[PDB]
Amino acid sequence: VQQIHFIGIGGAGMSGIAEILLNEGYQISGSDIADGVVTQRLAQAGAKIYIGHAEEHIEGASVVVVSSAIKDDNPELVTSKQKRIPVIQRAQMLAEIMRFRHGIAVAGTHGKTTTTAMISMIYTQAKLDPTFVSRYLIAEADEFLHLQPMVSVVTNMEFEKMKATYVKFLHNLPFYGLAVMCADDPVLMELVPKVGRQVITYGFSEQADYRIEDYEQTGFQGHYTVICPNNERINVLLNVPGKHNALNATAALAVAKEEGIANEAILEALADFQGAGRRFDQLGEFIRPNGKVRLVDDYGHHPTEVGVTIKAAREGWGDKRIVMIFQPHRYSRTRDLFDDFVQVLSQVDALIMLDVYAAGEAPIVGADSKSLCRSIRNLGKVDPILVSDTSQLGDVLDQIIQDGDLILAQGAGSVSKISRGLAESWKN
Amino acid sequence: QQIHFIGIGGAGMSGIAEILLNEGYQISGSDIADGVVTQRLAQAGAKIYIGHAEEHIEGASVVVVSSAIKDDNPELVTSKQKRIPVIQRAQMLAEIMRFRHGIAVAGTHGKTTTTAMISMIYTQAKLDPTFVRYLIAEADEFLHLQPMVSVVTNMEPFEKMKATYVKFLHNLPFYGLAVMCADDPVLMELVPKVGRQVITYGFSEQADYRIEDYEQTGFQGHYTVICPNNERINVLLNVPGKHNALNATAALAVAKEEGIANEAILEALADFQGAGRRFDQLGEFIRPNGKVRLVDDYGHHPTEVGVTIKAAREGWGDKRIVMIFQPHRYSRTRDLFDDFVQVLSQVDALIMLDVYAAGEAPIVGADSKSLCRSIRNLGKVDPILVSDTSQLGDVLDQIIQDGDLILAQGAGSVSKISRGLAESWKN
């Protein structure tokens, strides 16, 4: 079979598999209602894509792949059945693509994305040129039973039907396959006996095949040792915070060694593994007249993320004073999550509030920075300072600084444009 | 890298072991008994521990177990205790099919024979395929199976089942092949839900591979097969019945669709020797009152016995059909009682054996003394019930006539009886 037809090829989920099949050598065709980044891309790679579903669009295809985004009624779908042509779903196709390939499947409730990245970062440095979503295929497995990987990670499980679902999911490993599981999860460990494949554990746990000890988090970096199964030590430097990432890079490390990669690569990848965006970006330490301070840039603009960042920093040092500069993004948001903002932002030591970055929005009474500030002042955990003319920031700051202050420039508006200008000044 | 088999001696377990070994892995396994197998295996480089002892688990990675291993086993308890995975038989088998070009044959009736036919075909094509890079295998209702081709010969005693075949059909790759009998409506009715190319076969006008001009002469079948390019092939089949024709064809279609040469297929089917216990000719014997023929059949359901019957008639001119029939299971007898009466009433002489329990308790009204009666009341043939196996030879000799065809029919110990009987009659 030589021509494959995708109905609605620009939907995510499809382009990807389509591109894979395309590089494999198949002929590819499909259709969609909109011509955009995706279709133009596949298109220049050699696909034939129509715009609009039309019954003549099937000619030549041997199989036709469709999404659940496509509906019972589609002329292409409909016509295909009539013409015999095997119609298969995105899922089955993805499974197929795995069958003759060496795929690693990252599953669990938490950590899937980061682990997946951590593994790819690793295989890449290893010069393995893996494919991610050569012959290696790194993929995120989200709660699926179709995937036919050769390695499968389950980071954690946090009902009996769910339990059964995972068991079904691991069962798809080959007899010689590997399951890498978190030793620190009882649910998991309770499932081991039922697995029926080789099992590698990683964790802080007493009994971990790959054990983590003396982990310590310095600033937004993590420091720790891992004990491979033969009792050989590896001192890890992880460029992101929290034990939880230690856990995910250890699923990664675990998966990596056991396919034979040099510790050098493993370590290099992680050393240089960012959170995929603007998180904990340290702009520099600066000696000001009132002290030496670290100035860090963070994109968190929703009470939750804002929370993680503060907790991270707290654990980061342990005595440092956190002085944060926050710029609420959008009036809508501040209105909707006001009380939540008051709470989180009262978790720091000194707070300077910038005016809301409107992003397009017209101001909303009582959802602005004076409004937050007052509400915060009423809580009495922290007495905020409001700075509407950013031109003044550096000066207000220099007056409240204290030796060894961490300064978080927090938000997503022009806040990072502002903090950078603040470094430039200070640099001068 | 090490595969250990608990009770490797079993056939079904040896096959996989052997295959696993030529692949290049490293096998060990245990059995209470030494024997042909084990030495055969041991001799290829298998470490066969005669007898179960938790120490035979040395350097293994996974343990393959049959369905005959039970709760008390020593290698079992430590295995589990040592964190070594325990795999059953098929999954372990399905694994093997994965990276292979499996052709799996499935269905109600004809699996056994179809797989056979198919193997001899590829054998003849000099493909040297493995049977139980090619892998031809029989699949009995099988969802672990990852085949590149799957045949489905038929499906007859439900919706629940139907759904199962469908899913089975699915395990095929997107680019795979389903070969299904075109003359069967249920089958022909699931077609759409396949989601894969389907080729069909049979006598019916719409057959991709269609049968025409079928005539059984001697106990051989002659007929012509219309391949998809209206290209014509005349087939000589060394086995009787339209049923077998059907089987041979699905075998031909797989071969054809794989590009094999007509000459190799035609040779294959013309050279067919028959699957054991399937209209199996055990030979001619001269008894005091006739020279008779003795044939061993498996058919236990009533339709299968029917074809068997029609089959023999089609090749025994004017002569008589005598059957020794052994119902299998008390439950089945009751379910299809009437039909059993109907089909068993179509032979010239009938000897009935007692039901072969297969485990069941007797059900009142469903044994053989009850069939006999019903059958008698029908009045087409007067059955004789033979409860004391030892008396069979004698009762047989009393009713035989020169030229009889005698059918030892059934799934239970009837075959073993018949062979003993033959043995006895040879000497």
UniProtKB/Swiss-Prot annotation, chain A:
Matching InterPro entries: Mur-like_cat_sf (IPR036565), Mur_ligase_C (IPR004101), Mur_ligase_C_dom_sf (IPR036615), Mur_ligase_cen (IPR013221), Mur_ligase_N (IPR000713), MurCDEF_pg_biosynth (IPR050061), UDP-N-AcMur_Ala_ligase_MurC (IPR005758)
Q: Which reaction does it catalyse?
A: UDP-N-acetyl-alpha-D-muramate + L-alanine + ATP = UDP-N-acetyl-alpha-D-muramoyl-L-alanine + ADP + phosphate + H(+)
Q: What is its EC number?
A: 6.3.2.8
> What is any Pfam family matched here?
Mur_ligase
Q: Name one GO cellular component term.
A: cytoplasm
- Which locations, inside or outside the cell, does it occupy? Cytoplasm
Q: Does the keyword Cell wall biogenesis/degradation apply?
A: yes
Q: Which residues form the signal peptide?
A: none
Q: Where does it primarily localize?
A: cytoplasm
* HAMAP family tied to this protein: MurC (MF_00046)
This chain's function reads: Cell wall formation.
Which protein are we looking at?
A: UDP-N-acetylmuramate--L-alanine ligase
Native species: Haemophilus influenzae (strain ATCC 51907 / DSM 11121 / KW20 / Rd)
